[PDB]
Structure 1
Amino acid sequence: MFDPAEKYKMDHRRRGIALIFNHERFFWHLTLPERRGTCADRDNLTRRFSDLGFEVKCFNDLKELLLKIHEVSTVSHADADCFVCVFLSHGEGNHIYAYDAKIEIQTLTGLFKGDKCHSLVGKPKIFIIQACAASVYTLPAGADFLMCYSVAEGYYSHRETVNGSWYIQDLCEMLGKYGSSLEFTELLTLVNRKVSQRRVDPSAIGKKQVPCFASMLTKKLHFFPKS
């Protein structure tokens, strides 16, 4: 009967797809601090999710543009544990850039809701979002969903340095150190502390960046080593 510490089954053939999405659609102009900085985020996330047993796919949204997104949402995951989708964005941006991102996040999360994605029903769906038609909010829907945000609704966000961004650097450091050792919600709480304590001051306030994860998960999530 009822178990106070039930975990999602991690004994499926593969761990699944860690989709990485860097929002570059309507951004101009760009600089090498941010360019290689976003690269540093993407390169760092890839190696960390590859370590946890994920099949990493990343596509830029400037480039069949939706067909590369269909095959991911359309292909079966019955052999997989979970789905991870990382959304990367630029700190600075025009009003349109930030608008398209909110539309992309909305349509991207909607594809993996139980009504459309049969294979991932009862399986955790983690969307890691870098925050930057009247339904304009940072809140989507779905059961067994994990929404990870770099910034809480009204807070200040990092500018992307050459080495990357505050939220991503810290996420990868914790994923590298405790990725298979901790339940993922405890893991994100460490990212919550590390980023908020890292209130450092380059046009400072100084305002602190407060991350937030919205959890609709039903069980404990653990990325125990596979194979």
Structure 2
Amino acid sequence: FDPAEKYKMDHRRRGIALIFNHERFFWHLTLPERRGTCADRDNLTRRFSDLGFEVKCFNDLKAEELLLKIHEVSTVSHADADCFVCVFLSHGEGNHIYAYDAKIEIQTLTGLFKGDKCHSLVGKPKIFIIQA
């Protein structure tokens, strides 16, 4: 049983790199604009895509859209991917991030990839990157 052991990274595709980038907000949230966020989004796109991720961005999605998107990405087979990456660039309160619309608890989002719900990432790295 091997201390040097490394994840299998020999699959067909690297995997998906979801970015959720939020710049402006439903104005009754009263949250300031996040000015540099698109620079961040593009810079993340460049680097991850350079590591062979399939990068997929979404700008200013509302909670429902955000959810059914991430729900989709977690209901597609990752059978033939090395790992999964998911970035949230937004405002954050407690264990919540904000879509355009309302806040969503981060356990809700990650839970969609825990093993009992997402078979095909079992044993594979699931990387989340949160700039709240």
Q: Size of the alignment, in residue pairs?
A: 130
Q: Bigger radius of gyration, 1 or 2?
A: 1
Tell me what 1:48 maps to.
Answer: 47
In structure 2, how many angstroms separate the alpha carbons of the residues matched to 1:35 and 1:100? 15
**Which is richer in strand?**
2
Is the alpha carbon distance of 1:29 and 1:48 closer, same or farther for their aligned partners in structure 2, counting shifts above 3 Å?
farther
Q: Measured at CA, do residues 102 and 113 of structure 1 come closer, stay the same or move farther in structure 2, by a change above 3 Å? A: farther
Q: Deviations over 1:91-144 (max 9, x none)?
A: 899999599886342211010000100000000100011xxxxxxxxxxxxxxx
Residue matched to 2:56: 57
- C-alpha distance after superposition, 1:141-185 (max 9, x if no partner): xxxxxxxxxxxxxxxxxxxxxxxxxxxxxxxxxxxxxxxxxxxxx
Q: Deviations over 1:13-72 (max 9, x none)?
A: 000001111245745499999555100000100000000000001123535553322221
Aligned partners of 1:25 and 1:62 also within 8 Å: no
Contact 1:84–1:126 (8 Å) recurs in 2: yes
Cα shift readout 1:171-202 (whole Å, capped 9, x = no counterpart): xxxxxxxxxxxxxxxxxxxxxxxxxxxxxxxx
Q: What's the CA shift string for 1:195-227, capped at 9, x where partnerless?
A: xxxxxxxxxxxxxxxxxxxxxxxxxxxxxxx99
**1:182 equivalent in structure 2:** none
| CA gap 1:87/1:6 in 2 versus in 1, 3 angstroms | same
Identity of aligned residues (%): 98
Mark the CA change 1:30 to 1:43 in structure 2 (over 3 Å): closer, same or farther. Answer: farther
Is contact 1:14-1:80 (8 Å) kept?
Answer: yes
Q: 1:6 to 1:55 in 2, by over 3 A?
A: same
Q: 1:7 to 1:79 in 2, by over 3 A?
A: same
Q: Is the 8 A contact 2:21 2:90 kept in 1?
A: yes
TM-score by length of 2: 0.77
- Once the two structures are overlaid, the 10-residue window that deviates more, 63-72 or 84-93, is 84-93
- Gapped runs of 5+ residues in structure 2? none
Which residue of structure 2 aligns with residue 21 of structure 1? Answer: 20
5+ long unaligned stretches in structure 1: 130-225
**Aligned equivalents of 2:24 and 2:2: distance in 1?**
46
**Using CA pairs below 8 Å that are at least 6 residues apart, which structure has the higher relative contact order?**
2
Cα pair 1:21 1:60 within 8 Å, conserved = yes
The answer as to whether partners of 2:18 and 2:86 remain within 8 angstroms in 1 is: yes
TM-score, normalization by structure 1: 0.47
Counterpart secondary structure, 2:42 = helix
Q: Give the 3 Å change call, closer, same or farther, for CA 125–106 of structure 1 in structure 2.
A: same
- 8 Å CA contact 1:27–1:93 kept in 2: the answer is no
Sort the Cα spacing of 1:4 and 1:46 in 2 relative to 1 into closer, same or farther, 3 A: same
- Judged with a 3 Å threshold, the aligned counterparts in structure 2 of structure 1 residues 35 and 15 are, in CA distance, closer, same or farther, namely same
User: 1:16 and 1:52 mapped to 2: Cα distance?
Assistant: 10
What's the secondary structure of 1:40's corresponding residue? helix
What secondary structure is seen at the aligned counterpart in 1 of 2:119?
coil
Relative to structure 1, the CA distance from residue 104 to residue 58 in structure 2 (aligned partners, 3 Å threshold; closer, same or farther) is farther
